[PDB]
Amino acid sequence: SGFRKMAFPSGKVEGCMVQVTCGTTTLNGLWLDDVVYCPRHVICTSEDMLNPNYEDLLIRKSNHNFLVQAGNVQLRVIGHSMQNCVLKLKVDTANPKTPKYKFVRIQPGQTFSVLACYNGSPSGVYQCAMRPNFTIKGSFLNGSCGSVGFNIDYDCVSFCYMHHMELPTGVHAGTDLEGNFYGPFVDRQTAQAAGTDTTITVNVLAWLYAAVINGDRWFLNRFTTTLNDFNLVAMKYNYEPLTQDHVDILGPLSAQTGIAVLDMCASLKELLQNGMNGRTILGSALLEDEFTPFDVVRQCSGVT
Amino acid sequence: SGFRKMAFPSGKVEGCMVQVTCGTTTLNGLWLDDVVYCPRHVICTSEDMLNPNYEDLLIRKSNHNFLVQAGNVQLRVIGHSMQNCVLKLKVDTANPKTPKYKFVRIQPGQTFSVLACYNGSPSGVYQCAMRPNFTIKGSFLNGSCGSVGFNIDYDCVSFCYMHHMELPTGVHAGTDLEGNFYGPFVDRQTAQAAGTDTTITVNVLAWLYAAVINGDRWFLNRFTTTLNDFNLVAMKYNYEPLTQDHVDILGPLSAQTGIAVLDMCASLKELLQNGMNGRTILGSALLEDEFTPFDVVRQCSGVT
Numbered sequence: 012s013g014f015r016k017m018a019f020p021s022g023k024v025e026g027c028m029v030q031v032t033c034g035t036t037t038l039n040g041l042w043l044d045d046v047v048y049c050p051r052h053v054i055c056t057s058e059d060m061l062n063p064n065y066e067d068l069l070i071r072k073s074n075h076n077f078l079v080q081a082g083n084v085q086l087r088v089i090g091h092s093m094q095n096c097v098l099k100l101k102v103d104t105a106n107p108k109t110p111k112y113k114f115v116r117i118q119p120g121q122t123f124s125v126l127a128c129y130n131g132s133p134s135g136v137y138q139c140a141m142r143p144n145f146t147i148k149g150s151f152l153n154g155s156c157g158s159v160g161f162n163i164d165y166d167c168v169s170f171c172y173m174h175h176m177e178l179p180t181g182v183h184a185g186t187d188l189e190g191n192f193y194g195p196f197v198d199r200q201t202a203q204a205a206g207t208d209t210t211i212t213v214n215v216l217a218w219l220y221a222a223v224i225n226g227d228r229w230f231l232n233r234f235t236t237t238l239n240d241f242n243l244v245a246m247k248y249n250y251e252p253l254t255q256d257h258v259d260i261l262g263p264l265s266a267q268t269g270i271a272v273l274d275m276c277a278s279l280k281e282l283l284q285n286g287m288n289g290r291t292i293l294g295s296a297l298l299e300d301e302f303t304p305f306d307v308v309r310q311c312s313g314v315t
Numbered sequence: 316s317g318f319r320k321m322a323f324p325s326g327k328v329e330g331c332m333v334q335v336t337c338g339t340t341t342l343n344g345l346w347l348d349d350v351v352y353c354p355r356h357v358i359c360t361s362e363d364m365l366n367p368n369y370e371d372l373l374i375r376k377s378n379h380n381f382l383v384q385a386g387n388v389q390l391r392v393i394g395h396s397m398q399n400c401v402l403k404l405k406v407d408t409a410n411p412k413t414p415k416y417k418f419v420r421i422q423p424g425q426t427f428s429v430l431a432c433y434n435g436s437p438s439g440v441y442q443c444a445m446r447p448n449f450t451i452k453g454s455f456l457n458g459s460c461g462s463v464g465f466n467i468d469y470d471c472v473s474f475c476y477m478h479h480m481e482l483p484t485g486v487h488a489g490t491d492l493e494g495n496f497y498g499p500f501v502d503r504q505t506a507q508a509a510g511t512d513t514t515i516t517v518n519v520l521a522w523l524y525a526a527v528i529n530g531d532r533w534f535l536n537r538f539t540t541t542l543n544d545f546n547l548v549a550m551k552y553n554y555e556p557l558t559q560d561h562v563d564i565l566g567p568l569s570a571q572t573g574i575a576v577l578d579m580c581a582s583l584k585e586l587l588q589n590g591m592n593g594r595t596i597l598g599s600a601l602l603e604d605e606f607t608p609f610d611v612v613r614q615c616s617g618v619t
């Protein structure tokens with residue numbers, strides 16, 4: 012028993028991290044097979060970031076201007092190309108530690124692990140959610156760009172995120188591994204509105220099921236609700252509307268606990284209306300939304 | 316910016332995990348050099364756990380009864396010995412992936428990363444603290460025994476914990492890598508009192524400094540206090556007494572923020588007396604105590 016904000020083991024991703032330098036800018040790259048993926052703003056100086064013309068900036072760069080270092084050894088760059096907001100540096104050596112991998116574009120509300128890196132070196136790993144507004148609340152300092160987010164299914168690493176920037180609000184924005192930003196963000200140093208963030212309702216319900224499985228049950232009540240009644244409450248509290256698709260994904264947890272999804276919704280409704288009254292759920296005094304129903308099943312069943 | 320409950324990258328530890336089976340019991344082992352370390356209760360059946368005589372049980376076991384599997388390959392056991400509550404299985408092959416390592420016995424209030432494993436396979440990594448009462452609030456299911464806790468300083472892994480059991484209260488108990496339990500716990504299936512847990516005051520203060528650095532400042536007040544006045548409040552709220560050693564360790568954070576340690580104590584005093592009034596600090600509605608002053612400096616400076 013016990014419930015923790017668990018990240019995937021990061022080893023398969025640590026073996027892919029490299030340092031990419033172009034001019035005076037250094038950031039992290041992802042080496043998979045004979046390609047190194049990194050944010051295209053590696054070609055910018057601090058002055059360039061205000062209004063960069065990436066096509067024009069990249070034209071002043073040759074293969075030899077991209078310095079790629081994997082640990083202590085230097086990689087030979089034989090090709091370079093821009094795909095959306097990422098640079099793909101073709102190298103002459105395939106990464107011997109390339110795990111089985113896929114590039115995936117995750118949905119808002121889905122979770123993933125982030126391996127924070129600096130100078131191609133891993134410093135830490137944490138679990139987070141892609142917010143409904145397509146930002147992530149990470150922990151990233153200067154030099155963290157190019158750090159990646161991922162999920163792991165047995166031996167296959169699904170890379171879903173590459174870090175690019177921190178908004179003036181302190182939240183983070185990035186791309187998928189094809190270089191397409193999540194959200195309306197652009198890779199420019201300009202004021203960018205993230206938009207209203209909402210709570211991931213299906214994740215809060217999943218976490219409430221995790222709480223019941225692990226013994227925290229004080230919040231269970233004698234009430235029930237309907238999807239429409241629940242959603243009137245969810246709208247007032249900036250929770251995303253719960254759909255029958257969300258109810259269906261909660262099915263296994265509803266089956267394991269014997270608590271109907273709509274009864275759990277009534278517990279959530281009462282918690283939203285009355286607060287926790289100084290109490291905690293799984294060591295938290297707020298409603299946690301960074302665990303998907305899949306994460307709860309996985310952690311409660313010990314999938315390796 | 317941003318502050319997360321970050322674990323160390325787990326790769327160096329993933330390369331050490333093995334599966335150990337003895338009879339019908341399977342758990343995780345740690346393979347370092349030519350030795351595999353695992354909980355001695357691997358030799359027990361469920362019936363044995365009520366009142367085991369480990370010396371007598373181990374006498375019925377030979378090297379060939381210990382099945383050690385590293386991924387798909389079987390290790391040859393050439394020696395076995397019990398050291399406190401751990402078994403040391405000498406194998407004929409040194410682990411080629413053995414990182415630079417040390418065995419350390421951490422202090423209560425110190426933090427570490429846990430690589431949760433099942434059948435010698437890693438499932439997740441999370442950061443936690445050794446509670447003042449020498450328990451850990453983990454996430455461990457059946458088969459997780461032998462999973463280890465560790466810290467990483469650049470290339471050196473300091474193993475500090477090996478998981479052994481879950482108390483009837485749902486908290487976890489284990490040993491250092493010499494097999495000495497943290498706390499008064501014994502490796503028997505009997506009711507075991509963990510004792511009063513207290514909040515790690517120096518860690519809460521460190522996390523309050525992390526909050527100020529990262530922009531959350533609403534809790535800063537116009538007050539100050541003394542160590543003695545603060546400790547009267549800490550005693551009432553089951554916080555561990557703050558000493559001048561704790562103040563000294565907060566020195567770098569006090570220097571970076573320009574907020575005197577005793578002024579931060581007065582903020583903590585007011586938070587303890589008045590609560591958060593529905594507000595949050597670093598995305599938490601409670602006072603977080605699982606970040607040491609070292610963790611806050613490390614995360615705020617990007618140590619890899």
Ligand SMILES: O=C1C[C@H](NC(=O)[C@@H]2CCOc3ccc(Cl)cc32)CCN1
Pocket residue numbers: 052060151152153154155156175176177178183197198199200201316
């Ligand atoms: O998460 C981080 C990264 C951050 N660095 C950026 O955000 C750069 C510099 C600012 O101007 C910009 C503007 C756009 C882009 Cl894509 C990057 C950047 C430093 C602190 N933490």
Ligand SMILES: O=C1C[C@H](NC(=O)[C@@H]2CCOc3ccc(Cl)cc32)CCN1
Pocket residue numbers: 012356364455456457458459460479480481482487501502503504505
């Ligand atoms: O963290 C865990 C581990 C736990 N297994 C034990 O606690 C075993 C069996 C119970 O009786 C005992 C009693 C003592 C010892 Cl050392 C181990 C054990 C299963 C659930 N999660």
